[PDB]
Every structure is written in structure tokens, then in C-alpha cells.
RNA sequence: GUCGACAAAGAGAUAGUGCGCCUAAGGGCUUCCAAGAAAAACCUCUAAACUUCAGGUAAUUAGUACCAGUACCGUAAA
RNA sequence: GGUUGAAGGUUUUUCGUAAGGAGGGCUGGACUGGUUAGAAAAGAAAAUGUAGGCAUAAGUAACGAUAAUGCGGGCGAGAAACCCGCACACCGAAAAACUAAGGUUUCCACAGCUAUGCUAAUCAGCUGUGGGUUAGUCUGGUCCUAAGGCGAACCCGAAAGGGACAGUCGAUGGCUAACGGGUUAAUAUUCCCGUACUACUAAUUACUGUGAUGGGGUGACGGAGUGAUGAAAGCGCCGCGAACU
RNA sequence: AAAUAAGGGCGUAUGGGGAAUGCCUAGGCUCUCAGAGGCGAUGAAGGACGUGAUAAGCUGCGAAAAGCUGCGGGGACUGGCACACACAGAUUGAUCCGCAGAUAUCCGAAUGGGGCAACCCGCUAUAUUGAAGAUAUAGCACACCGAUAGGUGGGCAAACCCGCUGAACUGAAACAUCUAAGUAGGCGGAGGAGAAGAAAACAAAAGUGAUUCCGUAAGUAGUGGCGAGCGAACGCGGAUUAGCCCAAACCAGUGCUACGGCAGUGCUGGGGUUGUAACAUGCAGAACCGGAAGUUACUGGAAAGUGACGCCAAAGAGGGUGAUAGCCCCGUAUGGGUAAUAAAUGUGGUAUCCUGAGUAGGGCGGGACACGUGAAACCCUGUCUGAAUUCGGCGGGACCAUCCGCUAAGGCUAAAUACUCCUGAGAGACCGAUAGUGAACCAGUACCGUGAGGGAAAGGU
């Protein structure tokens, strides 16, 4: 279900202050499955998942092309524990 | 084969979706192993359905 | 498509500005039917790793290339004898 | 502290528990003829079902809450 | 006949009653064509003919509300239009804030002035790279139904098909638990802080008739007028805190 | 430096601009020969979304996702258009080709319910904290029949063919009968063809013997506001050739509706069908294998060109190669090898009974026959009426008598015939980029409209 972790400035500036980590998850997965996947994939007692769907760019040049819309999940890991990455 | 050491092998050899995550986080030394394991798992599935 | 001149075969140019420049076949484009022989077609390339005008080996048509026979030095045509070993139809010496 | 221009932690400052005017927002009430939606939700009863079960009530603890939108313009340069 | 230079383009000479033929120089770098016979997509100057290219009007009309601009610094090769600052002016039941329909990345940062902007531009809703949308309580589904649609069965019609009961969909309506601040360049009843609420499940105690697709009550509703009391905004006064003379 | 008439006109030369012409082909057009004529509930045509070490498009392929497996061919490169920096695989024999298999997300007949196509929401069985929020696999639409385990069909798509419906413009120099035309269009079904097809037929004193198609007959007979127009048949010459099965009378078994059974109506078997009319080894068959023969000097950037001297030819079709090649390459003629499939080895007879009933005819109103109600035969019927069984019935263009032919009211049937969404081979006194398909090129694309729909330009170092 988990494809790759998100590594951007906005998510890295909050993974330190708070305990929120970003992941790029499958399109047809819900929070109940995301929590269990990160749980029995890292063992960090994930709480408070938040999902968000993105859209394709659908750019056009001189030719058209979309950019594979996905869904990103922000998990709020328990205090004291962190994800290795 | 024997349908017992292979049914579990086709599931334990799925390090393809760990090497893929490793490569997505950072480029691995030999990226051409991804295609190799992606076709080996297909060979295993074919042999498993053929029994 | 089959070819009678594989890589690693000493050949001789029979047509072109060189017309007699020997060498060894390195690469073979089978779709374009063109072989790159070392020592022939020394072309210049203006590459922008500080480098200026570099020398490179350009391709040449296989029709302008003939194998050298094990007999007296002369170009020859090749046949197939079966193993499927190829001989020269000028001295029959393989 | 970031790269002298900025600049968050903190302090004045628990800075009147201040006074007057003003304030229908809405619901009710009156009247009139032109006489002014439906169903779901909520409460009660019983038909089949079962009896020391299962279901119902009150109090405590713990756990769980899904899918899609969330940018920007929107009396306009979108 | 031709890479010792073909067709094609440009000049020149000559021949024929003409349509036309032949030769030379220049560009051009691969085909061409005599004699006899044959065939036809066989000849343009006009159809307010068609397509492409280019002129004239001509450096002419115009540059899109008569709300308005001036100066000094900054980057920069380049500044009336960009950034900063001090002045001036305009809207202000608006030219202000939220947001529906709709648009579907136009949002934010950095590089660029080619095309786009009725001018130039170091600027941009433009170009290229990196980001941005976080919900148990907000809006829809998982709940309900109106107008209307589909519609087994049934009734009609040369065929396609039409009507239509039960049923099933259909908001523009009904039901349903949250408020105030802070942060980022871009998100905030969503993240954080403070403080609450609603529904379900599993344990434990005291307990017991629970119980529809069926019956009933409520949901559940018009126009106009409006006392009394009284919120939020608004106005006035004293007190208190800070800054300045 | 020079010149100068502010400027204009003419002639020559050199520039920009543009794309014509010339040459070429990546694509098209008309056909010939031989096949094939469908896909789909084991989920079609057509899409959406994904899939690469790198991935914006196109191509290929579906969570086994530029790919997996098996059998053959093949023998050095390969990881598509696509290159470059790279990284890997591969003589243990990769890549590639032919055939046969596996996987095959979502929408779509879409089929568990719904819906605004690519979405939402479920029930029953199992397992996962199993328990709320949720998950993984399997089964859950309709109609018919099968008695029951289960089978058949939904839909899409070129033309040919069949059946049901069915115009108008136009012509008649107007127009209504008529033509256009049973054409265009609409609807349903099947096959490689379909329809028709075996005489209740023609013909005429002589005869033929199922249907279909080609040439004449023939623009004839005829029909027609006898106007425009429409237009057969007989006979003859050819392609192909093929004929058969039931109902009934009758005989057996069997079910139903006075103490022998019979009668009627069902089922199975036999009988019976007409116009002189019961009682394994070889050939072919996929990729594939092999396939002859030229040296020199000159011009030239480059030889295939020119001159000289040679060779092959069952191969001098064609294409490519720095210019024009029989002997440079791919090929061509001849010859081999192939998996599935394959290829030759009864007679006569008196009487009696049966030969398709609301059927043939007829009245009324229409349609097709070349034939428009005309002297109108023949065929079909919307409504009504309604015959006999073989010395019977029908036809020979009103009708009657005689002669001749046939035997209706049941069915099947190949060949010769029509077409091309396709397939393999091959041609053109066919086009050559305003031509040829709208489209030689990221074309039914960009653009236009709410929608049906309309629809371009764009080749060359």
C-alpha cells in the first residue's frame, strides 16, 4: 500500500516540531488500512492519519500530458517514537 | 518446486517492493536488479499456476 | 536479417575515399546495415570535461567492405558449407 | 536567531468583574382569505421469534469514527 | 545524350506565316530525350471564381470610461509604468470581506524577456523549473422525499416502441455532534493551543419483556401587522496602561 | 574620400521576401488471381487509468503490466520510436520469427443495487483485534428449457441477400392519372453466399422436361391523360447439373374416454409417397536452409560512368550502396525442411379404401404481374360466403364445347450468381504534396457549436 515516503521542505519542517510524517499511499486505500499498514510495517503505533488527494498537471506544450495523480497520507506517530526512513 | 517450498517462495521473494522503495528514496547501486526481480516474481507466479 | 560479416573480423574497404584501409569490425548496426571498422572514417566532433575537437570512428556501408582471404591478399565473397562454416569462393580455404 | 535589514521567546497588562443611550436577531400573539408540500428521523403499541438466553435501562473504563471537496478568481485581467 | 555536368531558373543569338525550334554564358547538381505511330486529367485574362504570398490606402485611424500623478533611493547594460519611502487623488450598501454557479492550477518561490501584455520593461494571471489543498462536528454519499425519470407484472401498437401499479432513483427541501485564537511564501471550524459535544463497540455492577416491513402522535409549514423585554454592532463620559512634547 | 536634382523615370548588377517549377518518395487510386467473411457472459467493439534504471508523448502490455511459459527456426548481439551520460543480460547459446498456453485493473450488453461511463453502496459464506470504523476470496441480473446438477440468448460490426414499411424534388416544357420508385430512408434475421428450386409447368398437332446466371429474341408483342414514358414472353446458343423425404388408407404394441369386446381420440414401430396415376505409411502444410559469376587505366569528393580484356545465366524481375551495377549486398530461377492439421491406399389383378377443408372458387376493396378495369386470364388477401374425390380437380389471357398438359391447399436440397471490414501474391500508356483518401507529417487531430455535427494547414540539410 505504501509506495514511497514524502521528503519535502513543508513535511520536513514539521516532522521535527510535531511527529507528523508523510507517505505516498495507494489511490484506493482508506485511513483504516493506512494506519494498519504503517503499524505493521514500522511498528511505531500510528495515530491520526490524514489523507489528501492530488490532481494531475495536465500540461500542454508544442503535445499534452498528465502527471499521475496520487494520494498522500500524513501520519501522526506517538510521542517518543520516530520513523527511520 | 513441490508446491510447498514454492508457494511461500513466491511470497518471500517479493523484495521487489522493498528495493523499489529504497530506489525511490535514493538511487541504488545497480538499479537493473529491479527488473530482474520483477520478472523473476512473474516466472514464479507462472510456474505456480502451472503447478 | 542475416549478415556475413560479424564483429571481430579483419576486413578491407573496397569503395570510398579510403579504398584499401584495413581494420577490424567493432560494432554492427544490422537494421541500417552499417559496420564500424577501426581505423576507417576518422571524423571530427566539436564537443563542448574540457575537450575540443575529438576524433571518432564513423560508420560505413557493409557493401563497401569485403573480407580478406587466408590465401594471397585479395577481397573475396563468402559462402556457407555444412557446423555452417563460411569459406571464401576464391580459394576454398576457409 | 536568519541573511546592518529583519526578527520570534518574554514584560508593561488579571491594563473597571465600568457605567448610560441604543439594540428582534428570532419566537410568540393579532388579523385576513387566496386556506398555505411529502417522507425519513424521534416516542408508544403489538404481530412471528425466545425465555433463567439474546435484546432493553442507568453509572465507570477502554477502543473506534468511513468515502469525495478544501489552493486561487468569483460586482472579475481567472 | 549526361557528374568532361541532366532537368529546372536567368540573360543572349538565330530560324519559321504563327503556335514554337535550335545554340551560347551564369546558377543548378541527376536524369533526359530525337524519328514514326498511339492515348489524353492536353493550353486562362476576366466566372462580385478558390488557396497561399505580397502591396495601396499609411506610418494614417487607434492604443479600449477625463479617478492623477510628483520626487528620492534599489537591482539593472538599459526605468514615465518594476521594488522601497515620502507626498497627491479615487471607491468606500463600493472599486471592501466570505462564498455559490462556473473556471480546473490561473495559487507560492526562483531563473527569462524569445512569443503573449494594443508601448518599453529588470514586471506579470506569460515561459521553465521546485512546491502547495490535512475534517467524527463545514458541503455532498453512506439517511428521507417533491416535480420528474426508469419500471418486473399488466394494457396497447406494422417494427422500433407507447402507457403505467408495486417498486426504484431524483434537491432546489427535511434529519444530523464545535467554538475562540496562533503559525507557513502558499492549508486551515481541517494543523497546534484552550475548552466542549455526538454516535457505535467491548468489559463490570444494579437490572428487566425486548420486540417491525403493521397501527398511532409529532415532524408539518400562508400573507400582513406587532407589543413588552432585549443580544451582537454603534455612540457619549469617567477611570487605568503605554508612547511623545 | 567622392558624388549630389529636394525627389522622380528608364536600363544593368547585387540583396531581402516568398513559395511556384524541376527531381524524389514515407502515402494514396483502380484492379487481377486464390482464400476468408465475424467478435462476445471462459465477459466483445470502443475507451479510462496504470506499467520504464531514466519517461513528456507515440507503440506494446495489464498489479505476473516495453512483459511470463512450452515446442520448432536461428547463431552475436540485445534492453521499442530514442539518441547521450550510463547500468546490465547473452555461445551454458541470448535478442528476434512461427504456433500453441498463463495473467489480463476499471467503464462499457455490464449482468448484486444504484448512478452524473470509468464511480458510490451492499447480502450470504469463511479468515483477519472481529467488535465497532473497515478489509482478503467465492457466490449473488433477466428470458427460455432441464424434472433435477446445468445449458441457450442478450451487445457490436463493411458490402451482398431476405421480409415488413416507405417519400419528395424531378419529367410530363403547367398539373391532379402516370413517372421519379418500390428508389432514398427506417426496422428485424441468417449465411459465405442468400433467395429460388423439382410442374395443379410450357408449347401447339411437332415437341421439351427442376432452379439460377450470360447473349440474342427485342426496343418486338403489348401497355400508356394511347401523353411523358414503361416494356415482356416463346424459341435458340452456353456455364453448372441432383434429386429426394412426410400426412392419409393399412398392420402391431400401448394410454384415455355385457361379463366376448367394440368405437373414438393420443404415442412408438412398420408400410407408403404418384399423372405412361393401401388390398497406418508417404505428397501438400509456419517460420526457415542454400542459391552462379570483374579486374584494370582516366575523369571525378565519391564509379556503379567511359575504354580494354573475362565469366554466370532454368538466375539480365526489383531494391540499396558517396553518380547510372547480371558478376558489392539483399535478392531472383531451380532445389530442400517444416508443428498442428492433411493426402491415395418382384410380377399381375375384381371390388373396396386413401391422396393435404373454412381449402379451391365467388361477392366487395386493394397489390404484384410489361398489363393504369380494360375483352382482363394467372398469383396474395382485409371482410363475408363457400364445393367434389380420380367417369375428380386445375391450366392452355373474358367465356363455352372438344383436344393437350399437369395433379394445389406439406417440407428439404450443392454448382453455375452478387459484395469486400479483411487476407497472400502481383499489375497499371494511375497520382506525385493546392495532385492522390478529409488525413504521405502525433488526422477525424487542432479549431467551431449546448448538441447532432463541420473540419483544416503542415514532406525534402
Amino acid at each position: 500500500i505504501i509506495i514511497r515516503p514524502i521528503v519535502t521542505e513543508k513535511v520536513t519542517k514539521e516532522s521535527e516540531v510535531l511527529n507528523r510524517f508523510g507517505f505516498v499511499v495507494d489511490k484506493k486505500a482508506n485511513k483504516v488500512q493506512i494506519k494498519k499498514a504503517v503499524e505493521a510495517a514500522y511498528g511505531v503505533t500510528i495515530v491520526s492519519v490524514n489523507t489528501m488527494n492530488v490532481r494531475p498537471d495536465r500540461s500542454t506544450k508544442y503535445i499534452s500530458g498528465k502527471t499521475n495523480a496520487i494520494k498522500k497520507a500524513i501520519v501522526q506517530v506517538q510521542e517518543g517514537e520516530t520513523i527511520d526512513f | 518446486s513441490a508446491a510447498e517450498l514454492q508457494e511461500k517462495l513466491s511470497q518471500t521473494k517479493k523484495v521487489y517492493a522493498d528495493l523499489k522503495m529504497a530506489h525511490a528514496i535514493s538511487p541504488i547501486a545497480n538499479p537493473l536488479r529491479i527488473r530482474s526481480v520483477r520478472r523473476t516474481v512473474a516466472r514464479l507466479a507462472t510456474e505456480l499456476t502451472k503447478r | 536479417i542475416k549478415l556475413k560479416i560479424k564483429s571481430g573480423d579483419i576486413v578491407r574497404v573496397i569503395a570510398g575515399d579510403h579504398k584499401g584501409a584495413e581494420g577490424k569490425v567493432l560494432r554492427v548496426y544490422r537494421e541500417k546495415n552499417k559496420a564500424i571498422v577501426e581505423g576507417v572514417n576518422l571524423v571530427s566532433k566539436h564537443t563542448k570535461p574540457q575537450g575540443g575537437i575529438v576524433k571518432k570512428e564513423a560508420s560505413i556501408q557493409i557493401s563497401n567492405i569485403a573480407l580478406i582471404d587466408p590465401k594471397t591478399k585479395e577481397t573475396t565473397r563468402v559462402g556457407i558449407r555444412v557446423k555452417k562454416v563460411r569459406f571464401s569462393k576464391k580459394s576454398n580455404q576457409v
Side-chain angles (χ1 to χ4, degrees), chain A residues 1-8 10-25 27-38 40-78 80-83 85, chain B residues 1-3 6 9-10 12 14-17 19-20 22-29 31-32 34-46 48-51, chain C residues 1-16 18-21 23 25-30 32-37 39-49 51-56 58-68 70 72 75-82 84-92 94:
Chain A
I1 310 179
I2 299 181
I3 303 180
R4 57 173 179 86
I6 305 178
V7 283
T8 84
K10 184 177 185 178
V11 310
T12 44
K13 285 195 188 66
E14 57 182 54
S15 100
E16 321 300 324
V17 176
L18 299 175
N19 251 7
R20 329 198 85 237
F21 295 88
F23 293 88
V24 174
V25 297
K27 190 70 175 183
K28 271 295 181 297
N30 56 336
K31 304 177 180 178
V32 178
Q33 284 176 326
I34 302 304
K35 173 178 295 184
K36 297 183 181 179
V38 194
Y42 290 93
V44 277
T45 307
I46 289 318
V47 194
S48 194
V49 198
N50 297 111
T51 55
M52 182 204 317
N53 299 77
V54 314
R55 59 171 294 275
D57 292 335
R58 291 193 176 276
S59 99
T60 299
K61 60 169 295 183
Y62 297 90
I63 304 179
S64 292
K66 42 196 297 300
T67 50
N68 297 324
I70 52 187
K71 153 179 285 185
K72 39 190 292 186
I74 317 295
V75 294
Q76 205 271 334
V77 78
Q78 204 177 23
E81 319 177 37
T82 43
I83 313 183
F85 284 166
Chain B
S1 285
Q6 187 206 4
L9 206 153
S10 165
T12 196
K14 282 200 172 185
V15 305
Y16 159 76
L19 213 58
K20 201 79 173 179
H23 186 81
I25 307 165
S26 53
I28 54 181
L32 270 248
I34 302 177
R35 180 188 304 174
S36 100
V37 297
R38 190 202 297 118
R39 300 200 284 194
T40 299
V41 61
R43 290 187 174 91
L44 285 175
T46 313
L48 186 139
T49 171
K50 201 164 190 173
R51 308 181 196 91
Chain C
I1 174 144
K2 256 186 170 179
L3 297 177
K4 297 183 178 182
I5 300 177
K6 60 180 299 180
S7 300
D9 278 356
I10 41 166
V11 305
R12 179 186 302 181
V13 181
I14 73 177
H18 312 272
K19 197 183 179 182
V25 182
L26 303 178
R27 193 186 172 97
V28 171
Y29 312 90
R30 314 172 79 258
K32 301 158 57 185
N33 199 40
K34 291 204 302 180
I36 295 181
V37 63
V40 187
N41 264 9
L42 294 178
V43 89
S44 309
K45 182 68 173 65
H46 295 1
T47 61
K48 269 288 187 179
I53 301 179
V54 78
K55 230 61 178 180
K56 200 171 53 183
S59 324
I60 190 184
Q61 293 281 155
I62 312 188
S63 324
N64 305 330
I65 276 184
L67 288 174
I68 302 181
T72 78
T75 71
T76 184
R77 300 186 300 267
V78 288
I80 303 301
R81 189 194 312 182
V82 56
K84 283 187 177 300
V85 69
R86 60 173 199 269
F87 68 99
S88 99
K89 46 183 58 178
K90 200 170 301 304
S91 86
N92 263 56
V94 174

